[PDB]
Amino acid sequence: DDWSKPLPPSERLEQELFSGGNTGINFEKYDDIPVEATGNNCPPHIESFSDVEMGEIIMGNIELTRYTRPTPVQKHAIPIIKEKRDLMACAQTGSGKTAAFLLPILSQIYSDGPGEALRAMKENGRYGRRKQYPISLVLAPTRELAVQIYEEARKFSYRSRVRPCVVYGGADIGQQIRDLERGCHLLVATPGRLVDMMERGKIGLDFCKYLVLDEADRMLDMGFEPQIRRIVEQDTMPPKGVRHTMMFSATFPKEIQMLARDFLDEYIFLAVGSENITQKVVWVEESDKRSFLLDLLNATGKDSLTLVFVETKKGADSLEDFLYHEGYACTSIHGDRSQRDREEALHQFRSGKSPILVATAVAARGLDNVKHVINFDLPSDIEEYVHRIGRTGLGLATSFFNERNINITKDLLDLLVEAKQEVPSWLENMAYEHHY
Amino acid sequence: DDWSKPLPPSERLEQELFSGGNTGINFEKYDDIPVEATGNNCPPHIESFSDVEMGEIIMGNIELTRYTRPTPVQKHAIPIIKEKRDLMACAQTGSGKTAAFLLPILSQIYSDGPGEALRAMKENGRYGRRKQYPISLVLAPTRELAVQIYEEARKFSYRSRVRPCVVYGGADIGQQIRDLERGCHLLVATPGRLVDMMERGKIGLDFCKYLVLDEADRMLDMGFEPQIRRIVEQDTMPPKGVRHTMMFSATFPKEIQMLARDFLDEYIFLAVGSENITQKVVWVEESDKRSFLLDLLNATGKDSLTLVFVETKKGADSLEDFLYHEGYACTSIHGDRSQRDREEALHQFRSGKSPILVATAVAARGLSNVKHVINFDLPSDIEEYVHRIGRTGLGLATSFFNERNINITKDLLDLLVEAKQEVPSWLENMAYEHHY
RNA sequence: CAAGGUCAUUCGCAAGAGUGGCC
RNA sequence: GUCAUUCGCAAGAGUGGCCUUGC
Ligand SMILES: Nc1ncnc2c1ncn2[C@@H]1O[C@H](COP(=O)(O)OP(=O)(O)O)[C@@H](O)[C@H]1O
Numbered sequence: 008d009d010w011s012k013p014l015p016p017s018e019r020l021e022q023e024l025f026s027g028g029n030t031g032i033n034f035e036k037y038d039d040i041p042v043e044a045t046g047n048n049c050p051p052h053i054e055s056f057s058d059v060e061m062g063e064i065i066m067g068n069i070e071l072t073r074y075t076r077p078t079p080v081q082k083h084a085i086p087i088i089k090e091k092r093d094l095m096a097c098a099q100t101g102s103g104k105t106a107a108f109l110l111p112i113l114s115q116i117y118s119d120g121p122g123e124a125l126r127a128m129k130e131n132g133r134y135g136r137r138k139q140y141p142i143s144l145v146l147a148p149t150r151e152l153a154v155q156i157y158e159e160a161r162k163f164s165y166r167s168r169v170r171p172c173v174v175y176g177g178a179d180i181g182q183q184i185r186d187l188e189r190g191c192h193l194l195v196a197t198p199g200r201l202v203d204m205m206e207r208g209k210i211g212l213d214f215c216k217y218l219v220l221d222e223a224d225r226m227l228d229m230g231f232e233p234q235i236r237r238i239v240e241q242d243t244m245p246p247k248g249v250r251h252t253m254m255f256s257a258t259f260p261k262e263i264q265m266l267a268r269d270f271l272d273e274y275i276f277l278a279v280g281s282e283n284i285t286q287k288v289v290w291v292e293e294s295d296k297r298s299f300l301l302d303l304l305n306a307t308g309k310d311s312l313t314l315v316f317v318e319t320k321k322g323a324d325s326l327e328d329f330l331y332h333e334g335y336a337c338t339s340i341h342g343d344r345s346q347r348d349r350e351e352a353l354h355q356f357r358s359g360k361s362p363i364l365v366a367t368a369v370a371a372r373g374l375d376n377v378k379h380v381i382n383f384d385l386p387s388d389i390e391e392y393v394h395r396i397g398r399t400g401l402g403l404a405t406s407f408f409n410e411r412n413i414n415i416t417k418d419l420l421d422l423l424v425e426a427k428q429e430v431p432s433w434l435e436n437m438a439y440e441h442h443y
Numbered sequence: 444d445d446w447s448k449p450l451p452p453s454e455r456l457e458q459e460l461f462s463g464g465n466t467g468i469n470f471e472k473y474d475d476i477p478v479e480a481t482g483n484n485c486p487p488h489i490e491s492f493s494d495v496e497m498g499e500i501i502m503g504n505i506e507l508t509r510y511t512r513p514t515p516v517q518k519h520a521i522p523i524i525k526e527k528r529d530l531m532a533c534a535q536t537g538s539g540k541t542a543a544f545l546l547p548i549l550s551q552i553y554s555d556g557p558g559e560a561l562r563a564m565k566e567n568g569r570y571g572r573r574k575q576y577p578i579s580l581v582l583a584p585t586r587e588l589a590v591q592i593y594e595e596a597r598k599f600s601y602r603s604r605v606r607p608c609v610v611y612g613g614a615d616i617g618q619q620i621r622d623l624e625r626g627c628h629l630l631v632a633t634p635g636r637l638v639d640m641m642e643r644g645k646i647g648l649d650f651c652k653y654l655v656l657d658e659a660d661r662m663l664d665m666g667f668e669p670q671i672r673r674i675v676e677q678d679t680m681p682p683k684g685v686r687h688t689m690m691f692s693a694t695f696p697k698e699i700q701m702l703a704r705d706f707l708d709e710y711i712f713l714a715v716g717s718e719n720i721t722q723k724v725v726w727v728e729e730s731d732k733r734s735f736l737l738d739l740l741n742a743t744g745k746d747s748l749t750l751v752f753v754e755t756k757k758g759a760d761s762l763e764d765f766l767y768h769e770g771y772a773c774t775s776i777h778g779d780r781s782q783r784d785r786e787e788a789l790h791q792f793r794s795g796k797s798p799i800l801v802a803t804a805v806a807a808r809g810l811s812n813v814k815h816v817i818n819f820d821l822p823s824d825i826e827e828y829v830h831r832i833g834r835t836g837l838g839l840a841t842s843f844f845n846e847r848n849i850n851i852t853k854d855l856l857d858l859l860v861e862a863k864q865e866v867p868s869w870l871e872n873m874a875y876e877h878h879y
Numbered sequence: 880c881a882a883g884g885u886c887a888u889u890c891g892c893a894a895g896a897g898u899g900g901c902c
Numbered sequence: 903g904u905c906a907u908u909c910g911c912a913a914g915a916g917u918g919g920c921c922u923u924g925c
């Protein structure tokens with residue numbers, strides 16, 4: 008019985024599962040991703056589903072649901088889970104958390120098969136068996152979330168021998184029991200309803216190899232902690248390091264961290280996701296950047312430090328000489344500068360003898376109370392912009408923009424909206440005109 | 444013993460196998476390909492290796508060999524073989540053709556395992572068994588090519604339980620026997636040396652499931668046909684439809700077709716690959732295309748048909764009225780024309796009453812003895828260019844080119860070189876400056 | 880030497896746009 | 903309604919170019 012071999016299709020079933028619902032979304036607004044996965048021997052992230060062998064069944068079902076590339080949380084979660092490592096993932100709503108665990112878990116089940124224990128037991132007959140032993144257990148806080156997880160499981164278990172089931176409180180136990188008795192390899196459950204099934208001898212967790220806690224922060228908020236601990240610690244479920252455990256949550260309070268240390272073994276912490284700073288963006292042609300900078304400098308207080316960012320080292324030297332001949336006390340720093348020359352420049356800047364510092368990205372990585380940060384040249388990527396403006400200690404950041412910075416028009420626009428800053432209407436216009 | 448699981452690496456092996464040699468070549472000057480695969484229920488081609496699940500070992504070894512995407516012959520051969528169909532593949536030398544069969548075959552062996560027959564026999568001890576039963580046999584005409592096939596097999600069998608071996612004539616039979624005695628699952632062989640090995644009781648073909656005849660045209664020219672027939676038809680090799688047979692050849696003579704019908708079962712025919720047409724390319728700005736066309740028409744003999752291709756239906760109507768108001772008897776045809784209007788236009792064209800036909804791509808698909816085809820607008824792709832100029836019978840083709848046609852500068856340059864035509868120096872110059 | 884970003888060409892993919900051809 | 907090509911944007915990869923940073 009090979010579980011990696013797809014079973015014959017059903018045109019009827021395909022339409023019910025894939026025609027509508029949660030098909031793929033363009034996760035491009037978010038593609039400028041701050042994502043970090045820290046842990047011992049952390050498996051590297053993926054850029055395509057092909058970078059790991061999901062298997063024939065999963066790749067075909069991904070093609071039916073119309074996903075093309077992994078979401079940023081999936082880029083890390085999928086290789087982490089397929090390497091059989093535990094995962095603590097803090098990801099905001101709409102990141103693709105559900106598929107981030109369903110895809111690797113089901114892929115592993117297809118490759119490994121049901122295991123020796125299930126074969127050694129009486130095969131689930133046409134009249135079923137009273138008690139079922141799920142290979143994988145997913146815990147959810149509500150019926151709504153549990154049903155949504157279950158629906159995605161059907162899409163990814165299409166043409167497989169994995170039969171998903173879902174049980175939730177506030178419903179008829181009779182339907183759920185009768186649905187369980189037809190086989191259950193992946194179970195989605197609210198905690199209270201799952202405890203009832205275990206007490207009734209309908210569900211056994213002796214062979215549960217994949218445990219997922221979805222929306223874990225909410226489950227604690229709703230008072231499900233005793234049920235979860237009864238499910239995991241006070242029963243037959245294999246312990247940490249034998250089972251493969253994953254916790255997903257939108258927030259990371261200390262209550263979730265303490266639960267992670269109790270439930271997860273040698274795990275990876277995965278996190279996905281500047282408002283005390285006034286930010287201005289102005290259109291400036293290249294030949295006008297110097298004159299625009301002079302007006303800002305002529306408007307600066309007597310004892311306010313100004314940090315001016317430029318793209319190239321030659322541009323930094325050229326801008327320093329220009330400002331000096333214009334009569335402005337300034338200094339400069341870049342990568343070619345010796346450590347002594349950097350110290351001399353910073354000494355003048357900190358002392359205030361030269362309250363203007365012309366710097367490349369060398370000062371974006373903090374070498375040291377700057378009041379004004381000026382992007383004389385905007386950086387080529389939005390990550391550099393964040394590091395630059397964070398040098399302020401009220402704090403102001405002014406950036407020069409022209410057609411050369413069109414590569415960050417949307418990324419900069421998203422940042423201004425996200426930081427509750429004010430948005431030039433022409434920036435929105437150029438963004439939509441350039442991308443649609 | 445799971446054969447889909449990679450075995451531990453070896454830094455030495457990686458360097459010896461992958462550091463140099465024939466790593467990937469960008470099959471980019473040949474992205475524009477005439478490739479047709481014809482046969483009953485022919486599996487669709489692929490565009491990346493991900494489109495079929497090759498397995499962890501294969502995808503890992505592909506990355507080490509620096510292959511990015513399948514070559515045009517690989518796009519069809521890989522899915523055809525992976526679906527267990529026989530293949531008659533005619534492709535020129537240097538097409539990525541060795542890997543076109545090694546990758547799907549080894550992937551199948553990794554997934555299917557060694558089969559029941561091998562598991563029921565004595566394991567190859569460290570004093571290995573005497574007689575070997577290769578799962579896959581590859582036949583080559585010379586030692587040189589056989590070694591070259593074998594070396595690629597080493598790279599793709601890296602970290603696998605598949606052990607390749609190569610035997611060829613004009614060498615010490617002694618080394619080959621004891622290299623075989625250490626185990627052999629995939630065998631590369633020249634026909635003469637293989638016949639000897641069978642007669643020694645060293646090689647058994649009872650379990651060979653994948654038979655490959657590489658450079659089959661040369662093998663027949665070198666007199667290997669009786670040895671091949673003895674190898675395939677007069678021994679224990681499983682017959683067609685049980686074994687999976689592939690034949691590769693740079694040419695497709697009648698002698699190869701007859702051999703394919705004898706050896707291949709329900710096979711697919713795969714083929715990969717205008718000199719009596721003088722072709723001219725001239726730079727013409729858009730505002731000058733009408734004046735340039737007039738000079739050519741005034742230089743046309745009184746009784747010669749000219750076919751003028753344009754991009755849009757509106758362009759066809761506009762060009763017709765312009766020529767008419769200039770005193771040139773002409774007509775036009777495009778997709779929006781009713782069948783009656785098309786017949787009227789063709790009637791005037793073939794009678795010579797209006798020897799100038801202004802047409803869109805609607806006339807690029809055969810509808811006469813046209814003496815001059817003029818690309819007033821060059822098509823957006825080179826395939827359309829071939830179909831347009833093919834309407835001549837001496838026949839001449841003159842094409843207008845400007846910056847709008849930069850998207851086919853390289854493809855048109857390759858075509859003119861391929862068809863032994865004169866090449867404007869500016870066309871090469873613009874091609875290299877645009878792509879490098 | 881290593882690490883990062885952007886651009887140009889190419890390949891696939893998704894969304895859009897434009898042209899063409901078939902009914 | 904179906905089909906083909908091109909172009910814009912976006913993801914990735916390969917090549918090239920360019921810039922930045924660390925010894
Ligand atoms: N690889 C992907 N590509 C495109 N869209 C995806 C992908 N993975 C998930 N999605 C979509 O993201 C949306 C959110 O799914 P969901 O799991 O509910 O996010 P979350 O659970 O973190 O709130 C769904 O519409 C889903 O189809």
Ligand SMILES: Nc1ncnc2c1ncn2[C@@H]1O[C@H](COP(=O)(O)OP(=O)(O)O)[C@@H](O)[C@H]1O
Nearest residue numbers: 465466467468510512513536537538539540541
């Ligand atoms: N998918 C690929 N991507 C890039 N290069 C490839 C690919 N496949 C093969 N090649 C290269 O193409 C060249 C031709 O290999 P070969 O099999 O001998 O062509 P052929 O057999 O048609 O004469 C080799 O250098 C090989 O490494």
Ligand SMILES: [Mg+2]
Nearest residue numbers: 537540541657
């Ligand atoms: Mg060859």
Ligand SMILES: [Mg+2]
Nearest residue numbers: 824850851854
């Ligand atoms: Mg092109």
